[PDB]
């Protein structure tokens, strides 16, 4: 009911090879050509990726910036307020980023900020201006 194991004999395949006397070799030349084609298209991309691999030498290790370790205080200096209002306008509502900018306020206070000082720093407008870009 099933062919021997490791024997591949499908109905589709046999007409395949038996339409004419040269068809058996003719197909097997197709597959020999399909193989060599894919084979060099590998060494093409192998060399294209070889060049791009070299441009990335040194990695980005010059351009690294040391880690700033700040205990997260909850008082708001005015300086920290002005930093906020600027981050909003430049960052829309990515609180994490905004929290990253101010540096000593985690993401919750940023969101609480957004409502406590919402009237006085005129947040609503700033957001439309940040929406405009």
């Amino acid at each position: 009911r099933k062919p021997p194991k490791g024997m591949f004999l499908s109905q589709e395949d046999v007409e395949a090879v038996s339409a004419n006397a040269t068809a058996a070799t003719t197909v097997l030349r197709q597959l020999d050509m399909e193989l060599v084609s894919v084979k060099r298209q590998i060494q093409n991309i192998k060399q294209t990726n070889s060049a791009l691999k070299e441009k990335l030498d040194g990695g980005i290790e010059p351009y690294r910036l040391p880690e700033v370790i700040q205990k997260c205080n909850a008082r708001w200096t005015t300086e920290e307020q002005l930093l906020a209002v600027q981050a909003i306008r430049k960052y829309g509502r990515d609180f994490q980023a905004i929290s990253d900018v101010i540096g000593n306020k985690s993401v919750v206070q940023v969101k609480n900020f957004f409502v406590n000082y919402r009237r006085r720093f005129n947040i609503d407008e700033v957001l439309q201006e940040w929406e405009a870009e």
């Binding site: 062919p3 024997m7 591949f8 395949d13 597959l31 590998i42």
Partner: protein, 666 residues
Amino acid sequence: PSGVEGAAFQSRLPHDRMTSQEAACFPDIISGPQQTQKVFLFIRNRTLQLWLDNPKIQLTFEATLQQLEAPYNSDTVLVHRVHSYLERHGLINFGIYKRIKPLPTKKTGKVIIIGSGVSGLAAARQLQSFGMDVTLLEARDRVGGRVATFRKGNYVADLGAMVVTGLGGNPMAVVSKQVNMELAKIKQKCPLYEANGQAVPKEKDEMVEQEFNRLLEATSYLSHQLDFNVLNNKPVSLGQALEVVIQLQEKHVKDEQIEHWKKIVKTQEELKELLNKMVNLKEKIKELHQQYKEASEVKPPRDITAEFLVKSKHRDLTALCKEYDELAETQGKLEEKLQELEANPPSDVYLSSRDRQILDWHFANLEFANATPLSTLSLKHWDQDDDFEFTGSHLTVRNGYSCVPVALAEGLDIKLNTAVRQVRYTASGCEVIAVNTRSTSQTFIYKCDAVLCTLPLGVLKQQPPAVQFVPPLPEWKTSAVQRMGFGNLNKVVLCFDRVFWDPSVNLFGHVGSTTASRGELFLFWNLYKAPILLALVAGEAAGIMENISDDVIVGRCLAILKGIFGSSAVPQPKETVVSRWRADPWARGSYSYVAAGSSGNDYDLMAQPITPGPSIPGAPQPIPRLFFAGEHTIRNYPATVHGALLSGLREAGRIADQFLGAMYTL
């Protein structure tokens, strides 16, 4: 199997069921109550057992009824019917046995047997055992036909059949008790050696063989599961089927490498798109760093916009620094997949150049078994007789398998050097017309009631005809003769004075340099007492080597033996013989095969006897006058010595039934 049940099996009969033939002689019992059938079946099995347990003496009906016991020996006619049925169709009291009851003073009916081959002899003995006048007409100066045995000095070697295929159910088993046959088992171990004369290592030898067997199966799948049996209005052969399977295996091998490397480009290209994301990200991180630098050099004290600009540029650079780190995890993952994928390449080839040559040897020996190039064997029907295979080791015959036909010929009227040349059968009887083979002038006329023809199929095939049938054989018979296949096989007998081969191997192969010569001297046999090696020429190679002389052929054998054993170790042979069976005009080949476009049914056509037309028109439908036997006439066991023998016993029963009457059918 043992007991009375073993007798049935050793007689090729089911112990528990009645055969189509026994139905025909006992149609009362088979339609009858199931109990009578078991009685009958026991009486048959028991009587077979009696005969089988000692086959050197006739088993008389009286003797049989004595060792039966009640209730079975109650009904004497049932016992007489059964014993006589068995005696008629040669299931008992066949071969060479001692006559309790000596022959009748006077014979009844006269029958001519064309051919003293085993088929012939076996019927002859049976007919004479039945009290008919039997005469055998033989073109050769010897009996045995295609069972031949070279003898010179104490050298002995069959040029003809040499293997007994296993005694489990084999009628030759009985004959071997009757005639002493030194029977020796064939140790199946066969070392193959390549052209260079070096052995194949057990790695390949088993790998290739296993591939062979797997390939054979594959064709059977093509045949039975995909109905690949016709192609462009012509029937498919085992050879074609094998190529298609080999090509599809070589195709799948390429299909497998294509999707393997296409898994690589799918990944190389995933990596390409990953590096361009990484160069372009690194060039943005180059640029923010400068911007954050530039803006960190505005020495403070700063207004909050220029403070925001340091802190924002610093946030941005550490977020782009985060991206580029995750992307280098992702290039670590992918750059590792390529290492693995390259390290696991699939199979380079289907079969190596050496591999395919060892494969050819397994094909040659396959062509050697069936005596024909595979390209001719019918794919659908070539292994139709595989179902009736005997049990037990295979054997050879040390004293030369001619001992058997010679043994059978004892007591029989045999005209040697008598070439039958015309067979004339008519409503009222037959005339056979033969010549003397030495002076073809001297002509002979033989009158008889019936003619049994054991002419080899190669001779029946011959055009223009070596034997003329008058009237001609009807189309249904001649067509069966064109359709069937007559093969060819040949051997070379090498007679030395030293043993220089491994005496523990019965047989060892030689691998041929091309597909075209795979059969040329591909296998050797250490079979005998004397230092005799025996070398096969099978397949396409068989009919081509027949156009080369002995010396030329012998030189190549020496050559091949040199390779395996070294030019020192093998002397020139003392005595050499080469066979040419397709050349021989009393053979025209070696034995039958199931040709493409033939079927098993042609073997049954070959047996159907011929009944001539009425002489006086409007006279009653006459008797059948022309009968056929021989290895080509026995569908279940053709191309074999037993098959011949059985067919002999068969027609003998049939002719007797016809000219002597069969009182056991009442």
